[PDB]
Copies of this chain bind each other. A is one copy, B any other.
Amino acid sequence: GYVPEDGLTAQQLFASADGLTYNDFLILPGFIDFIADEVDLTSALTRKITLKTPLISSPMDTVTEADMAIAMALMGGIGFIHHNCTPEFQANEVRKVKKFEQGFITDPVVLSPSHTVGDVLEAKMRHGFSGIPITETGTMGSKLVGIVTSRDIDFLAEKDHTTLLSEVMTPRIELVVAPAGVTLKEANEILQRSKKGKLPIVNDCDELVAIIARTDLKKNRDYPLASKDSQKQLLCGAAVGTREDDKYRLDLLTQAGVDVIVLDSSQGNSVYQIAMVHYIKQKYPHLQVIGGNVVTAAQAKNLIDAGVDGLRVGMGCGSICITQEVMACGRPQGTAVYKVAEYARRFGVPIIADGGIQTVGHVVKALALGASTVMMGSLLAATTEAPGEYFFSDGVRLKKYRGMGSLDAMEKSVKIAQGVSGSIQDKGSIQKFVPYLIAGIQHGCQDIGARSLSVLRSMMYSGELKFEKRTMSAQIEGGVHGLHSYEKRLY
């Protein structure tokens, strides 16, 4: 009949202990009754935002600009766009993420019939797309007079300069349309049946109110996980500081349509951060705030009291970071995640485990310890979507990976540095790499016997999930060992 109890509960693992890292422990295997592919990875980012994937790209200038944030959101994670740039640059990166996928396009590029083929080529150069509805004024609210696309300007070579759009358009008599007040699903069925690539939406006065594009329905079927708002735009996060000038940056990011703000700090338990959370929650009540760089429940209390919608957890972990060796201050990250999540769950506040995520097994550990999402810096650095360009050193394709408190960065791009300006080897695309992390998380949960990240956390808090501590020699034994050379071909 009976079998004895084996391993520690999480409450036991952190009680009789020094601060553990992810490397200091294993999760004991459970019972498998399900397929890894059926493991649900649905994740709370904040009180009101849910992601289909637990994964976040960190707000760093060598990790997250618009290409990373688009790719993360398409993979069912999110990106937070970094703030080591002008307020206007950051708002433009946010605008790029929000424009990439659209339901109703309500603020399209529009031209007059008095504009020219060269104005459509300049529009395509400046905004990326050729499909431009034509209205009497060349402003959105006028009577629809036609539609111009790349197939209409295709191979009209050097006629750019003075060819008026009127003779180039598909004229309004010829175009398929939907009435205003059509639902997105009804407009999609009209567009799908029409076999056209645009469907203009016009009111009873025959003037343009929105347009929809077939490329968004293609993006729909291409990206089943994608993190979208109610109007089917990709979710975007952005960082801001807690200085007075961050109020201007915050206003630019909110009119760019940012969904969630992260307050970027080494040590978020401050009068400056509590003041910024209160300022945001009064001025932009719709806006989700991750106020958050904490490692203790005492810090978490003050930000949850200030009204944060999520917390970022970690201090002095993080591959690029030297905060612990400069300020003495921080915590071992597994202990921090467990302590802060066990407290913050009482208030319904989700936890982001930030920094020190070197492997997909560290992601599964962070999630098992009570994180609702995991934020990666270096693990996503030197992907193709990460900012900047590759170079070669001793014989190796490398990309920069900076740290936002490195004294390269800061400098308006005595000053105390908290980071160290690294290099990282090439990883390829986020659109292949994040599906690998997803499958790794799913197989980790499967070996543990958890059908979802929600049941994984419930097994952890009930004490059904068992842990074993590792000696240093268990960390050697659990790594690659005894070989001459090896080829770590992940995915």
Q: Give me the interface of A with B, judged by CB distance under 8 Å.
A: 3-4, 6-7, 26-33, 151-152, 154-155, 170, 192, 195, 214, 217, 221, 266-267, 269-272, 294-302, 315-317, 319-333, 335, 339, 343, 356, 358-362, 364-365, 368, 378, 389-398, 401, 406-408, 414-417, 420-428, 435-436, 438-440, 443-444, 446-448, 466, 468, 470-475, 477-491
Q: Tell me whether A322 and B29 are in contact in the complex, defined as CB-CB below 8 angstroms, given that A330-B478, A478-B330 are known contacts.
A: no
- Chain B residues contacting A321 (CB-CB under 8 Å) are 480
Q: Tell me whether A26 and B331 are in contact in the complex, defined as CB-CB below 8 angstroms, given that A3-B301, A6-B339 are known contacts.
A: yes
Q: Is the CB of A392 within 8 A of B490?
A: yes
Of B329, B390, B406, B483, the residue contacting A447 (CB under 8 A) is B329
Q: Is the CB of A491 within 8 A of B416?
A: yes
Of B152, B407, B426, the residue contacting A195 (CB under 8 A) is B152
Of B29, B152, B356, B426, the residue contacting A269 (CB under 8 A) is B29
CB distance from A61 to the nearest CB of B (A): 16
Q: Is the CB of B407 within 8 A of A491?
A: yes
CB distance from A153 to the nearest CB of B (A): 11
Q: Is the CB of B33 within 8 A of A270?
A: yes
Number of copies: 3
The 6 A-B residue pairs with the shortest CB-CB distance in the complex, in nearest-first order: A32-B270, A414-B439, A422-B483, A328-B364, A319-B482, A332-B474
Q: Is the CB of A483 within 8 A of B319?
A: yes
Of B326, B329, B358, B473, the residue contacting A26 (CB under 8 A) is B329
22 contacts between A and B (CB under 8 A): A26-B316, A26-B328, A29-B296, A151-B195, A154-B214, A319-B481, A321-B480, A322-B480, A325-B359, A325-B362, A356-B481, A391-B487, A393-B488, A394-B484, A396-B425, A406-B489, A407-B489, A408-B489, A415-B439, A417-B489, A417-B491, A424-B484
Q: Tell me whether A296 and B6 are in contact in the complex, defined as CB-CB below 8 angstroms, given that A397-B427, A423-B484, A491-B414 are known contacts.
A: yes
- Chain B residues contacting A335 (CB-CB under 8 Å) are 468
CB distance from A5 to the nearest CB of B (A): 9
Q: Tell me whether A421 and B319 are in contact in the complex, defined as CB-CB below 8 angstroms, given that A195-B152, A444-B327 are known contacts.
A: no
- Inter-chain pairs besides A26-B331, A328-B361, 17 sampled, C-beta below 8 Å: A3-B300, A6-B296, A29-B267, A323-B447, A326-B443, A327-B364, A329-B447, A332-B478, A394-B396, A397-B426, A407-B489, A414-B436, A420-B489, A421-B487, A422-B484, A423-B483, A423-B485
Of B331, B477, B483, the residue contacting A401 (CB under 8 A) is B483
Q: What is the bound-complex CA distance between A474 and B333, given in angstroms? A: 8
Q: Is the CB of B329 within 8 A of A29?
A: yes
Q: Is the CB of A426 within 8 A of B423?
A: no
CB distance from A53 to the nearest CB of B (A): 13
CB distance from A295 to the nearest CB of B (A): 6
CB distance from A453 to the nearest CB of B (A): 13
